[PDB]
Amino acid sequence: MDVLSKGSLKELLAHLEKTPLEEAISYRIGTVPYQNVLISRNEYYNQLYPDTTSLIDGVSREGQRNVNGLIMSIISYVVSGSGHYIPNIGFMLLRRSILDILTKHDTGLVTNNLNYGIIARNLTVSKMNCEQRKRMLICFKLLAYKDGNQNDYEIYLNQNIPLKQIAPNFIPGDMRTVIHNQDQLAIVGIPAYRLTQSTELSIRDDNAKSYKLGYVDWYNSNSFLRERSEFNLIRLKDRDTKYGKLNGW
Amino acid sequence: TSGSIINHANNLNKVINHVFADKPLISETMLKILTIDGTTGKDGYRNWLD
């Protein structure tokens, strides 16, 4: 919910710096990812409604124990709000931030063998919307810069024409590029249209609307932080600053 | 519910007005205990009945 609310590149990377990896990993068993299932949608149909479960749903799924599953759990958390079930990763890796895993070699995780095409296909890039594809491409660029695979990232964009048009423009080592970026990455937000307490047909759409309706409740909740009215009560370390720089950028 | 609270508040006031009218139902000894904190006799009895 909090990760889906971020609407700018600066906010997204700032959230990932303060968020540990354990938030990406889920400890609920879930179900196997790719299955043709029948779900109940009584608002629309009397018969059961066919659908296919996927990894970018908002509900936890079972994940492979390899490094591929860990990266695929991080991206699903960013684009869908929930991760997958990969237990016994370890204290050392789980305490690191999401940005450290994606960008830093000191974590101890080796990810240079990853194939962006296979990861995108397993995440069902075809079913993703524009904001979801932009968020995943941000994760790919950070991984490419960590492994020195910038050339491979560009070629993968050349093969996929729709991905090249929406590819965010920022150098993963320079903070000046992040501040200038004006891409809108928000998935949930205050809706200008009429939003009703009604169900959706597919699993992805229904789960997304739950976060959208939950965010509205979160926005008016006491947990939400109102910068306009309570800026002085925020701690100085985590207070918003114009000259905000990620470490090493 | 608002209806229950409104109904209870009005009925409570009606009973208190009637018990204290004419010769009060409760004695002066009880009123001394209820008014020891500075509240009025009618107010003290209304809280205790509640």
């Binding site: 701690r235 370390k237 | 519910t1 608002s2 209806g3």
Partner: protein, 50 residues
């Protein structure tokens, strides 16, 4: 006020740390209490009800 400290000293303390400091000194009021929702209805009369 109660633990004899200053704002700067307790600036970085979290809620649970602050609760422990006050509870040890003997102050029990360290919790927020949720309100109770009262259900309300307006009788229709000429207009539809709410």
């Amino acid at each position: 006020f109660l633990t004899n400290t200053t704002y700067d000293i307790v600036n970085n303390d979290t809620i649970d740390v602050l609760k422990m400091k006050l509870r040890n000194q003997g102050w029990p009021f360290v919790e927020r209490y949720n309100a109770v929702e009262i259900d309300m209805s307006v009788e229709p009369l000429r207009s539809p009800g709410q």
